[PDB]
Amino acid sequence: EKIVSIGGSTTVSPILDEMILRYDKINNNTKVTYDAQGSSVGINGLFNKIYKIAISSRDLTKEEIEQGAKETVFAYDALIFITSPEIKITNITEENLAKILNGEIQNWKQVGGPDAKINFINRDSSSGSYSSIKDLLLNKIFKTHEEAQFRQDGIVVKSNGEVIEKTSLTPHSIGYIGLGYAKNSIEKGLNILSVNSTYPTKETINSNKYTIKRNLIIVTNYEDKSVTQFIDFMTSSTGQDIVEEQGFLGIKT
Length: 253
Hints:
The chain is α/β, with parallel strands linked by helices. 36% of the residues lie in helices and 23% in strands. Strands 1, 2, 3, 4, 6, 7, 8, 9 and 11 form a 9-stranded mixed sheet that branches. It has a two-stranded parallel ribbon with strand order 5-10.
């Protein structure tokens, strides 16, 4: 029997677990396991021969590449920005969006919108969504730690569904939710913004034209056949159906 020990991001545990059990229907001669203590721990475990594959929700560093790391994307965790429907703005650049998030822009007029104070609805700081927006927008747009902090008087809520409800009740408001909640936001009569003139769709997220997403990547360090086989399953149509059945966005196959 072959053994493929995998480690990495906590966010994809039930996807990896289902992939393991479904791949076992095809090939019961490999034992695959997933231990989810985080992306960085997974990559460290890969380099130390504890894992043969790491699953990461963050981009590899140059040091990791220099140590031989290679990656293939297999899923996306995208976020979208929703507003109350009386703000007529339909599009925002990443730069301006980051300045709303960090409090440098606090009235819609500052970007040509109506004269109306912005009510920013933020997520709780323990959430994955908060972490993703901080990492994807604030930490990339702003040079210093002090600048790369959220506006401190945001209206804080503890779930995607509550961002939608709060946005529906709060005038001139903006919040962020996972892509999977787009339908719910529309049914509630809210508006989803384009970012850099790009709406978040499977095509624009796959092309990397829509910028607000984490790329979930398979990381290896010539692989064992057992590893190649499992990765081939992960990126297969069945693998990708599992990704989407569990609320993430798949790649093209």
